[PDB]
Amino acid sequence: MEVDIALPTLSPGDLSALQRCEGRVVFLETLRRHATLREVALPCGGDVLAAMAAYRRRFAAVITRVTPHRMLATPLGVGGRGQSLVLQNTGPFDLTNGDHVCLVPPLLGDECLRLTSANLELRFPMTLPLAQARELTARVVARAAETL
Amino acid sequence: CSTLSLVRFLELGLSVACVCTKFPELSYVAEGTIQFEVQQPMIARDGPH
């Protein structure tokens, strides 16, 4: 089960940068085999809580092979508990061995991928250890509760 | 004397509507059927569908 993400014609100066994305996860709405890239899209920063809630309704998928034609991605978890794979560490902290990981939306809206070839940006989240994702979620929910 | 005008079904127009069959054992049959099978064509599609 490997999903297929097709691409439009992009600039040769941007496939060289998108190809460097081989371990960041995307968030699809459905799990049909063939799929487009326009569907998986996210605006720039804003309302970290909204995205955090959206990270429960949609299920993740790790990408492993890029081609200027299509993109092969792996449905992360729906039915498998042993699919040993690799994903890059785009988190601020440093993760040792035997650490359960967690996807958290990026902060400040500073780090995104403005793709001008088709006018759409993809905000790949960051991967943190559980112990610090818990404190981050706690701080944000406390601050949200503070404002009545 | 008015002779009858013999008409046969094979010479009419409606012959081309139905195929007929001399089946002498018809009164012997229970519920009888016919069977069909068709295959609808399909067109390829360039689609993420």
| Secondary structure (3-state) at A139 | helix
CB-CB contact of A115 with A18 (8 Å): yes
Amino acid in the structure at residue A142: A
**CB of A6 within 8 Å of any CB in chain B?**
yes
Write out residues 15-34 of A within 8 Å (CB-CB) of B: 32, 34
Interface contact A32-B47, CB threshold 8 A? no
Chain A CB contacts of B48 under 8 Å are 4, 6, 32, 34-36
- Residues of chain B contacting A, Cβ within 8 Å: 47-49
> Bridge partners of A27?
A60
CB-CB contact of A67 with A10 (8 Å): no
- Nominal resolution (angstroms): 4.4
Q: What angle do CA A85, A42, A61 make, to 5 degrees?
A: 15
Cα distance between residue A134 and residue A118, in whole Å? 36
Q: From A30, which residue of chain B is nearest by alpha-carbon distance?
A: B49
**Checking DSSP bridges between strand A70-75 and strand A34-36, what pairing results, if any?**
unpaired
